[PDB]
């Protein structure tokens, strides 16, 4: 596998992990709890949750909604440099094959060397995005841990409903595993997104005191995996409602609090997955850099036509791969997101 062959896999994988974070962020923004008749503990839950939602709005103000715009533009710049220089490079390779010439050799070497400029920008833009993502993630995790600790204190004090609190927490933890199984399973291009809302502590006339959000997304359509995820989450919620039948609505509100962490926790997961995908992508981009450095070095040292054409297999293989990368990256950069919203009650 060459570097460019690997990048055919590694580049959509990183954009794949990025789109998920948009959906997790959207799940946070759409999570809501109303005070109702609650007393004493509500103010801090509301404060903690508002603190997490503020961090998402700050993150989105960067403009990196479905993916890093700077990483995408550096990919496109590499691909366009290949596309724009193909004929001049192939012309020189051909001429040099027939008769070695020092000036044309220096010319062809300068053309390959122009590939290294958008490659440096890509590697630098990956590090700058990863650094900002990791800084933000640590703040999200701190805020998640504050809200979690608030909820644990409230719940451990409601000694008369610990049976129903445990049965509900059990279902919430199953929903987390089902979300994780979906993401495992998905690991014609576009951006396809489903946002979920989970209704808890309902009112007889309609509505509820809690709306817990989460979201998933992918760059190829996967309507079947989404449906299985939705049926699993529905069945978990139906189980929660069955197990809370013996509680008042005010007790339902307390027993359901950890659903507020569902989408916050997914933000933590998704940030981590992007970073791992970017470590992997960084390694492959440096492997492309070092292939170009080896061609530049071999061209600089070549004395005859034979030395020169040995470097043309690297070039033509990379050109063709990069024209496929161009089409995928442009499709994804041009895509209008296709969003569907699912209420689970
Ligand atoms: Ni208290
Ligand atoms: Ni039962």
Residue numbers in the entry: 6 to 192, 199 to 356
Reported in the publication:
The proteins MakA/B/E can form a tripartite toxin that lyses erythrocytes and is cytotoxic to cultured human cells. Here, we identify the proteins from the five V. cholerae genes, vca0880 through vca0884, that are coexpressed from the operon makDCBAE and analyze the crystal structures of MakA, MakB, and MakE. For structural analyses, MakA, MakB, and MakE were crystallized in their soluble, compact forms in which the hydrophobic β-tongue is hidden in the interface between their respective head and tail domain. Each protein is predicted to undergo a conformational change in which the head domain is unfolded and rearranged into two long helices in order to assemble into a membrane-bound tripartite complex.
MakB and MakE were refined to 2.1 and 2.0 Å resolution, respectively. MakE is structurally very similar to MakA, with a root mean square deviation of 2.3 Å calculated on 329 aligned Cα atoms. Its tail domain, 85 Å in length, consists of five long helices (α1, α2, α3, α6, and α7). The head domain, 55 Å in length, comprises two parallel helices (α4 and α5) and a four-stranded antiparallel β-sheet (strand order β1β5β2β6). β1 is very short and originates from the tail domain. MakE also has a β-hairpin (β3β4) protruding 90° from the sheet. Two molecules of MakE are found in the asymmetric unit, along with two nickel ions and four sulfate ions. MakE, which has the most prominent break of the α2-helix, has no proline at this position. In contrast, the hydrophobic region in MakE constitutes the first central β-strand (β2), the β-hairpin β3β4, and half of the next β-strand (β5). Similarly, an elongated form of MakE was modeled in which the tip of the long α3/α4 helices is hydrophobic, albeit the hydrophobic residues are more concentrated on one side. MakE, with its shorter β-tongue, can penetrate only a single membrane leaflet.
